[PDB]
């Protein structure tokens, strides 16, 4: 295939390794999640526009809609976490270890 596909999936893999290795900040992992959804959007619309699948042009709008819905859910859960503890550090979520 084309090398633009190489760079798009390579960006997806970068943001996947970013999400799966935490840096003691939940919001940065949320940003990595939005980066992964952006990469999925770009890849999908690239192939859809190249292969002239015209009816599938409505799809990435729906995908980005659900991306933002789950982002809003993540932000609300982060408000609850930051209202319990002092900060948003991911090491404070260790009560369920005993």
């Amino acid at each position: 295939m084309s090398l633009v596909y190489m760079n798009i999936m390579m960006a997806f893999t970068v943001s996947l390794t970013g999400l799966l290795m935490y840096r003691s900040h939940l919001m940065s992992s949320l940003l990595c999640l939005e980066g992964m959804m952006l990469s999925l959007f770009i890849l999908a619309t690239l192939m859809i526009l190249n292969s002239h699948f015209t009816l599938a042009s409505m799809m990435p709008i729906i995908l980005l809609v659900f991306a933002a819905c789950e982002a809003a859910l993540g932000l609300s859960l982060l408000v609850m976490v930051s209202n319990t503890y002092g900060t948003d550090y991911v090491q404070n979520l260790n009560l369920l270890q005993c």
Partner: protein
Amino acid sequence: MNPIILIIILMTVMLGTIIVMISTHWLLIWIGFEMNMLAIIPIMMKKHNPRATEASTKYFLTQSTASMLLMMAIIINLMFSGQWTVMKLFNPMASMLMTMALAMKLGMAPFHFWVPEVTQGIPLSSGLILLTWQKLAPMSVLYQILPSINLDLILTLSILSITIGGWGGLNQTQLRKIMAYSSIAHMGWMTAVLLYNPTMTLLNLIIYIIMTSTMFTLFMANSTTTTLSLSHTWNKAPIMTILVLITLLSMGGLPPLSGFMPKWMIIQEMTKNDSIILPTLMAITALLNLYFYMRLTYSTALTMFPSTNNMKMKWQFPTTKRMTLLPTMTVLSTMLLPLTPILSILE
């Protein structure tokens, strides 16, 4: 919680599950997964304690990452196929990513870490809804794509989750963590047979759902969440101790009880294809599961642990709980073995 809002949220969860179950499109499958997850998040936050926030955050992160892998597999299949139909995948990379996404959604080892913590941090009813309802859409999608799953990957996941769940169930004194590790072992049991005969997987799904629903309803009715709290039931209602005794005996695959029927048919199906070492290993780890079930039933039924003084005050009041379908579900979870050829209706 407003009961109208709770009813709306529960119907939306069910709607997401059937949207996954009835659609012929990968994007609609993904939409159903997203709406199910985002509608079951607030059920786990019903009591508003920090443990519910921890459980909801960990569950949200795991299901989000699994959904991303699901979408990547879908997009790669679109690339190499040019279509969207829910059938086998036309790429091994997409098949492997879809299998790991559905394993992360099912809580299969080595993606099993979130399940005991999420199960512990949420109330008993939300845990029941999780462990029964949420474990149908990934099983349905796995039923759809069985021509394309790599046998080595799915068998590795199945035996790994069986061994890890059976080993981890030996070190728990809370009931919800015990139930989560038992759930991990049972998903290993079902998916070890999926590539051979998926009707066996459907039968195992139904029996496991019935059995764990009966046990969760028993724990809700007695209002016990730890084993030392479960040990007071002989001073409260001995019939409930008899019920938990027979259901724990059935849950270990002990004949002539109905819980032995799934494992028996799994061993029957997997030896038609000359695989003998694997069902023996699964049988021995099922013995480990039966061990921690035996420990629980020694705690609650076959001995009389010391009770307290206020148990008299609890004697004076009869229960008014809404034990919905408990006797029917107990009977189905215990004595369904002479009706074994009923399984052909799932063909």
